[PDB]
Ligand binder design. Sequence first.
Ligand SMILES: O=C(O)c1ccccc1F
Ligand SMILES: O=C(O)c1ccccc1F
Length: 516
Amino acid sequence: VTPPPEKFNFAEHLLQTNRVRPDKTAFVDDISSLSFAQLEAQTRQLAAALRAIGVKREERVLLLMLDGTDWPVAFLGAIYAGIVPVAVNTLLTADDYAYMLEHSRAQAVLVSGALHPVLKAALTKSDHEVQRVIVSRPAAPLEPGEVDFAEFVGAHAPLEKPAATQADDPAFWLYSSGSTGRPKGVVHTHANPYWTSELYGRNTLHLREDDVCFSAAKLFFAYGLGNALTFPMTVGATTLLMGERPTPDAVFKRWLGGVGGVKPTVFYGAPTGYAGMLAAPNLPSRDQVALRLASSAGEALPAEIGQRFQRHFGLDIVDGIGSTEMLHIFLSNLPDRVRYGTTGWPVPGYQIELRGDGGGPVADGEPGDLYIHGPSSATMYWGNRAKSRDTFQGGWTKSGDKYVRNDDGSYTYAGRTDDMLKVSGIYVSPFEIEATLVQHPGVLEAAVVGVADEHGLTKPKAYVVPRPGQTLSETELKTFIKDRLAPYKYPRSTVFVAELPKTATGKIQRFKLREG
Ligand SMILES: O=C(O)c1ccccc1F
Ligand SMILES: O=C(O)c1ccccc1F
């Protein structure tokens, strides 16, 4: 793979690539579609629009949008202007967004109408610097000074040239959280999505022009940003986007060609989703679908799920691991070489190391902490030098995962070095869930651990000491957690216990709860 030139704008790169196919569909959703040409036009008008409201080069904008055709216009339009979009999870709280606004010093917000209520709450509460709110598909009347996305784009002539950025200039941010503390602003360069799209999208998956890509993983996820934007645009594939929550039925509807008169050839999702599909009574048969490739990430794929999908479809699931910090997958199975119970082999272009207690290599068959050296690594966490030091060092990125290398050179997942649970593509902090539970007046103490369910998929499990003198039923606690947490954080079950095991410091011995 040839390195990008030092003068490089990733958006211009993707536009240029597709000038050969102006009339092919680039993106399609339930209500709209853009050809590559229409996408280019709208991308450049949005870039002009942002500039005309005074957003400058290197300044951030918040991109808080459901998957839809306006998403890649917002993302690429900012990048084409040399403005840095901060692409965020659409399921967070107003407080989360308030923090992001302050931390990013976002100068404008591009927001889906459905998300305007949360965003409004975030604006009201924070010391932000937002100059304009641009609403895609408004769902309530616009407030004074807000503008409709279609009008904002339609009101401005296309910018004539992209910003003259360098390959190693910041291009976009994603946010990633740890087990405590605020989300960290992961800063990616213009070169980074070129490398992931070439080393993984093209050279590993062998995506091609005639493909139709459909990712259950949304565009704000690093995994989904590659799957359903950078990868397909790099090869001229057509991409299907879906605003709604993925469920088996919504996925199957699309697999069967229920939207945009296209049937996906490449599907991407989490092991949890693949399990949920395989359990669905109306799972389609292989003759009804056009799938040629099925990708998975977001948690380790249990072997039985891959094996059952292959028995039903005659297609393997291709499991690989990436991270927000590395932008996309660096260790993967291949479309023609799958070893279930493993995450496969290093992706060419990326170097992997497993390190023991002192930094040194570990013998084969033994677990070590996983570190990655590749050209798509983020540069830093913005404004957090201490965490940057811990994660990015001398070209190596520390993943927080442990792995074992097998005799055939494959890698098998061995757990985490920090307590986070990966529940279907979203990291969930047990400590968050614990701090929520103890705010119920009937709960004295709470400990949350991950437990593998009947399909081998990790879900949170809560152990709760109730407060003597109150009543607290499992149902009231369910109602309370329904009211306080996103469903992606719910414990799969809660057990009431009389006490928890602790050190004399009062540290809860969570390892004993993963035992019995
Ligand atoms: O990945 C997912 O989140 C998903 C959810 C439902 C059905 C298929 C899927 F892949
Ligand atoms: O969940 C993953 O393995 C993953 C894959 C691609 C990019 C970011 C990720 F976190």
